[PDB]
Amino acid sequence: HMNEFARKKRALEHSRRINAGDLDAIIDLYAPDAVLEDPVGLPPVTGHDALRAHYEPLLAAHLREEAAEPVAGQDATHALIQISSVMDYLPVGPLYAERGWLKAPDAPGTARIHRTAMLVIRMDASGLIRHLKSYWGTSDLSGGSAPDEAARKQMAVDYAERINAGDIEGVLDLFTDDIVFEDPVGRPPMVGKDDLRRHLELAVSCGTHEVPDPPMTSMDDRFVVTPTTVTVQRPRPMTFRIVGIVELDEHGLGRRVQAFWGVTDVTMD
Amino acid sequence: HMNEFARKKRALEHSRRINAGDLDAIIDLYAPDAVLEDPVGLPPVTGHDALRAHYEPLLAAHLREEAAEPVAGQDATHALIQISSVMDYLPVGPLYAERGWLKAPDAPGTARIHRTAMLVIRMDASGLIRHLKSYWGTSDLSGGSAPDEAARKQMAVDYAERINAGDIEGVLDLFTDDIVFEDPVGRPPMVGKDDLRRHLELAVSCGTHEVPDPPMTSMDDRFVVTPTTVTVQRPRPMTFRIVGIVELDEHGLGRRVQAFWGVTDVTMD
Ligand SMILES: CCCCCC(=O)OC[C@H](C)[C@@H](O)[C@]1(C)CC[C@H]([C@]2(C)CCC(C)(C)O2)O1
Ligand code: NA
Numbered sequence A, B: 001h002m003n004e005f006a007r008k009k010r011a012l013e014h015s016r017r018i019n020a021g022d023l024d025a026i027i028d029l030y031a032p033d034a035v036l037e038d039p040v041g042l043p044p045v046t047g048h049d050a051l052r053a054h055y056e057p058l059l060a061a062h063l064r065e066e067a068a069e070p071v072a073g074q075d076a077t078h079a080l081i082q083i084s085s086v087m088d089y090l091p092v093g094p095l096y097a098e099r100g101w102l103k104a105p106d107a108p109g110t111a112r113i114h115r116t117a118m119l120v121i122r123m124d125a126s127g128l129i130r131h132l133k134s135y136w137g138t139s140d141l142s143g144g145s146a147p148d149e150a151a152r153k154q155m156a157v158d159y160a161e162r163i164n165a166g167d168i169e170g171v172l173d174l175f176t177d178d179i180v181f182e183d184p185v186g187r188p189p190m191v192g193k194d195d196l197r198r199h200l201e202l203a204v205s206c207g208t209h210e211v212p213d214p215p216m217t218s219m220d221d222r223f224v225v226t227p228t229t230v231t232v233q234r235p236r237p238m239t240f241r242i243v244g245i246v247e248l249d250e251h252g253l254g255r256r257v258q259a260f261w262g263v264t265d266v267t268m269d
C-alpha cells in the first residue's frame, strides 16, 4: 500500500525522531519484533525491549543526525538514507574504544564522535520498520582506528572509473563469475557475466557517467556501500540517485550487488 | 533549447493565417527569397511573386487547414506540423484532375477536396520561413487515384510492427547498407547497418513501442513521412512524438532517415 514517496518520507521521520530525544516515539516506528543491525557485521538487535537498550545511550550522548535526501527501492518495502552523525563521547564512546574502533581521547568529557552511515530500511505496508541495516565501519568513524579495507573501499570507486571510460571488461574483472546484479532492486536480477556484459554494453551505449559519494563498509568489510549519481545522455539527459551494496567474497571480488534506486529517483535535466 | 517553442508557435501561425485568408498576412511570414515545395516532388516556388500566385487560387477555393500539435527539430531551424485541409474543387481542382491526381467530379460546383500533408518548415534566426517543404501524394488526396505507393507507405508501418516485436534483423532489412539515420535531427547521424543495430538493440532493451499515424509520401514516391508516438518503459516511462522523413531508393529500400523530434517533444507519465 505504501509507495516510494511515503517510505522516503518515513525514513526522514526516523532521523527526525532520533534528533528530538523522545525515546518512545522512535520505538513506535519499529515493529514489535523488529531487527536492527547497528552496525552491520555485528549480531542484530531484536525487540522493542532491546531497542530501548540500543537507542537510550545514544540519546544521552545527544545524537544529532544530518540526513541525506533518501532514495527508495522498487520493492514496496525498502528506503535507504545516509546519516551523518555527531555525538558526545560519553557514554557510547568508551564502548567503541573497547571494541577497537576509537582511540580513547585525552578529554573524554569534551570529545565528539563523527560517523557516516548508510541505513537500509525495510518497512511493511503499514509504515512499521521490520528491519533496519545500518552500514558503517572504522573508516566511517572518528577516533583514529582504515586497515586496507580502503583497498576494498576503492573497489566501489574503481567501478565508476572503469565504466566512465568504457572499459567494460575491467568492470567485469571486479566481480565473481556467479555475479548476481540486482538493478534496480525489485526487478529480476542479472546472473552471470554474460547477463552483466549485456547490461554494461547498454550503459556505454546511452553514455552513462557515474560519480560516487565517499563509500562506506560494514564493520566486517563483507559489504561495500556506494552512493552514486549516474547521469545518462540518452534518451535525452537524465540523472539517477542510487545506493548500491556489494557483497565481497574471500578475496575481495564482487559476489552480489543490490542497486537501490526507485522511479522517483530519476530526473529530467 | 526552448526556441523550439517559438518555432512551433509560428508553424501554427502559418496554419492560422491560411485560415484567415489575407494573402499578404500569410506572405509576411516568408523571407524575401523563400522556397516552397508544395507538393514535394514538383518544381519549387521561389520569391513572393510565385508565393502570391501559389496561394491565390487556393485561398479562392476557401482553403481551411486543421493543424496538429507541431513537432520541432534539434537544429534551431526546423519545425514540422501535420496539416489536414479541405477546399472547393474549382478552381485548382481541374489542375489536379489534368495531372491525374483526381478524377473529375460529376458536380464540380459542390465538390470539395481533402488533403493530409506534412509541413517541414526551415526558418532563420528571425523566424521568417526560408524554405518550406510540404509532403503529400495522390493517396493523400481525394478524387480517386498506386499499388506501389501503398507498398511504400506500408514500410512506415512494417518498421513499427517489427520494432515492437523485437525483430531487429527484420528492421535492418528495410534499409540499404548506405543508411544514414539522423536520430535525432541535429545530433550526429548513425551511418551503416552496424551503427543502427546498436541503436536498435538499445531500443528493444529500453522497451520502445512505436505506433505511427497514417503516413504520407512525396508526389514522386521517394519520401515516406511517418508521424509516430514512441513510448519507452525503461529507465522510466516517457513518450516521444517524432515525425520521420525516409528517403527511398529505386528498389524501395530506405537510404536516408531524418527523425525530427525536439527536446520539447518528450513527456514523462
Ligand atoms: C558499487 C556497486 C554498485 C554499482 C553502481 C551502479 O549500479 O550504478 C549503475 C546504475 C544503477 C545503472 O544500472 C543505471 C542507472 C540503471 C539503468 C541504466 C541504464 C544503463 C540505462 C537504461 C538501461 C535500462 C539499459 O540501463 O543505468
Ligand atoms: Na577511525
Ligand code: NA
Pocket: B138, B139, B140, B141, B142, B143, B144, B145
Ligand atoms: Na487518392
